[PDB]
């Protein structure tokens, strides 16, 4: 009953003093801070009541202590925490979309589907999502902001069966990404952020709109040839459009 | 409603004296002409009766004052006004055909159709119609004739739905263009115009006949594969014929 | 008159049911709808009073019935009808500008003017306007919006005489286009449309500002050399600037 | 000596009538205007009180007479004087930054410093600032606006000693330039100027953010290797980063 | 009311001790020096009388204290302060000429002038002046001399109207530059400076004489064709000489 306890206590004691630099002081202040954090954790667990609210309070405490006196940054100029949280959520959504596209590329590449062009297209889309996520991370690093990488969620659907359901899921994901981008643009406009707004509306929407249009065209073509009730239509769309 | 009155009176006062050259006389004769035209318009409107006949009489007056003493031309030799009117009608029909082809290219390029090859073919046809119209305009300018550009009419059909109706409309439009060209040839033969007749029968019919034959072949192929009751036939004709 | 009656009744009966698909039901519901529309037209013509208000009411009815339950679109996300109407008006203005530039190119290419460089420049400007109009149409199609192509108006001036009046008309047309673009930008900003705003301010204004500056420079050069009271100045500006 | 009096009176008499065109009238109206301006200056100097307020009133009078009836411009459409003043201040700041970068490049190129890579980098930065200033001037000229070139201020620091102080000064200058650009963007947004806003946020911020990030990285590298208390660290950063 | 006081006191306290090196002593001697300078400024402001003479005395004190015991230089051999002041004045004149040429290039590039060849020529002349100024700065740095960058003065004329006045101003500026170069040569000859004399008479006069000759030829051509009373002459000189 101490493994999970050790894992949950080794987070705050590392978030408080993350750089144990031995090129200055000794290592007794670190031990004092560890003992103080252990006592605080003990008393707050004694004064607890449940388990989920305890984890929520721990997360809130970690988020509060990580914004104390870190000298802000050297290149950060006029940037609110709401824009940072929006960028973090957008990066998380980009990573989730890349994971979903990777799962789609690996599903159509199996033996029960046998569709190489769809797998290659989904792999290219996953690579584009990864490049967009890396570009967002680099832009956030250039603006002097922290990046809080959370846990990447797993795709809710693993068996795509045919191809129409996968196209509908991709279209819904692209619509959600577009809605998130619109919310980010609105938040940057309401919080005075011209550079991020211009960067998002220039080097991101120009590709997202084209991707949404291509997915809509693919769905329209699939919903007219005879899919999913036409096995030859899928082969024709495979050996011509993405082939 | 005086804005319409000003817009309808600013046409004749500009058609009478279209070149207010300040490198000679002053600007009192122009004012006298404007006052005379205003008085004429006033008395004619007081001696009117309806609205459509008034516009028809104004159009007839404009057409009759634009053929007064403009020294004809310096390169115009043996050319009747009937041939000029026929060339103007042919140019108007060419512009209408180009507009219809542009509308067809922009309709198939949407998201509810998703047909890129048909859109590219219609765009190429619109470009060919535009080049033919420009060539007709240049030929009319080289013969010393006036060009009366009217208003380009809008396509009567905006929702082409499938592709068979668009092909039938294009075939009917090409048949109408061929009939207009035959009427122009007959009028030029009856009015002694060998140069225009030869130019039309050489540098125009050779492409119109091929276009009509190609459209007929496309219609025959669509009316045998299973269109419009076959979604795969449209994709096959897209990814092979125009692809 | 019954030909005009047939032409005006064949619009609503085609706008109500535009896709007579024979791959499902028969053709008796279409006949019933045609009879109902004919009865409606008859009673509304019996309950009429004039002619212009009748056409206005018919246009309003057509515009109302074309926004019923067409499933909106598959790629349309956050887009008000005001922005669509503004895009339609901008496309109409672009087509009118292209027509005016074509008329200018064909006027200077005649025998009474003899200016090939001005004609080539006006033809290039008309081609640029056509490309911009096609790009606007493609952008509207990618956003899931309808395109209502109206009637292209004819140029109010046909005899440009010299070149200074043509330059002034082109400058006024460019100023009107810039004002329309500013109004479109303001409407997109007030209706929350970041993508269209960015696209218009990036891939359109960068060329419109340069065109306005070039036309202003040409007007300044013409209003200093001696035009229009200097025949050699026009030849010098032709065989150097646009030559 | 009347040197200063003549120098201060030769500015208003040249700002009132700046174009003594001899291709029209004679030269007696110019003499009358000069005499009137001399009488006005005499009476205003008799009704003066100090020296600094006199120069301020003269500057205000010059600024108010230079906005009388100059026909505005031929390409200026929707542009307030506040945006023009902001563009002038931005151009002045760009010129000051270019002068400071030139001074930095010439200081490190001396014999008491002996740093060629830093001098080359500062010269490249000065060239970039000069190109940005020329681009701003060209953009202001294309919008039909006046450019009021003031006096370029001298750098407050001439002896940069080491390299860390120069990097801190460059970082502060870049932060001031970014703040000025943000103020210009806010003023253009509050005064309805989409074209200038887009141009500034596209063709200027993309380089300013990268320059600020590079300067921050250089400062971070210098504040970790041992500078300024490490002579070898400067040589290592010279013969690797900028070498 | 203390902003100007702080700005004027932060000059001497920085000129006395310009290198606050923390790699040796502490920071109490700097505070003592600042307090002493503040007391000196206080007593000398109490013992003042006017404002302009106060600034002159401050400038003289700054110039005196900047020549105390800076170990002269390591490459400076036989070089009097008069030659250094002459080089500084020549550099200031070169910067002023570059600024005037930039203003001329930006004025002719506007919309009310429309002269691209003149603008390009003036930009090339400004680039040549900038290169000459950089070469002079590098030569002064190689001789072990200080460079006192003052404030660049603004051009006295902003509205050049035509082109003849601009050519006359450029000719007068080139004559002033030639006179300054002759004075510098005479001062270097009277103070025994063969290297600087040879460098100035070789790598500077060879271009200045050619520039003066070209400007004289341009003025002679403009004063014979009909300028400024001939609008076609300016266009001919633009589209042939500098075109």
UniProtKB/Swiss-Prot annotation, chains A, B, C, D, E:
Cleaved signal peptide residues: none
Ferritin-like diiron domain mapped to chain residues: 77-226
Subunit structure, interactors included: Oligomer of 24 subunits. There are two types of subunits: L (light) chain and H (heavy) chain. The major chain can be light or heavy, depending on the species and tissue type. The functional molecule forms a roughly spherical shell with a diameter of 12 nm and contains a central cavity into which the insoluble mineral iron core is deposited. Interacts with NCOA4; NCOA4 promotes targeting of the iron-binding ferritin complex to autolysosomes following starvation or iron depletion.
Main location per the UniProt record: cytoplasm
Any one Gene Ontology BP term: immune response
Source organism superkingdom: Eukaryota
Name by which UniProt lists this protein: Ferritin heavy chain
Pfam families in UniProt: Ferritin (PF00210)
Reactions mediated catalytically: 4 Fe(2+) + O2 + 4 H(+) = 4 Fe(3+) + 2 H2O
GO cellular component, one term: extracellular region
Function field: Stores iron in a soluble, non-toxic, readily available form. Important for iron homeostasis. Has ferroxidase activity. Iron is taken up in the ferrous form and deposited as ferric hydroxides after oxidation. Also plays a role in delivery of iron to cells. Mediates iron uptake in capsule cells of the developing kidney. Degraded to release iron upon autophagy activation by nutrient starvation.
Protein family per UniProt: Belongs to the ferritin family.
Binding site for Fe cation 2: 129, 174, 208
InterPro entries membership: Ferritin, Ferritin-like, Ferritin-like_diiron, Ferritin-like_SF, Ferritin_CS, Ferritin_DPS_dom
Lineage: Eukaryota, Metazoa, Chordata, Craniata, Vertebrata
Organism: Mus musculus
Keyword Acetylation belongs to the record: yes
Phenotypic effect of disruption: Homozygous mutant embryos die in utero between 3.5 and 9.5 dpc. Heterozygous animals are healthy and fertile and do not present any apparent abnormalities. They show slightly elevated tissue light chain ferritin content and 7- to 10-fold more light chain ferritin in the serum than normal mice, but their serum iron remains unchanged.
PROSITE patterns, per database record: FERRITIN_1, FERRITIN_2, FERRITIN_LIKE
Assigned EC number: 1.16.3.1
Binding site for Fe cation 1: 94, 129, 132
Annotated localization: Cytoplasm; Cytoplasmic vesicle, Autophagosome; Autolysosome
This protein's UniProt keywords: Acetylation, Cytoplasm, Cytoplasmic vesicle, Iron, Iron storage, Lysosome, Metal-binding, Oxidoreductase
GO molecular function, one term: identical protein binding
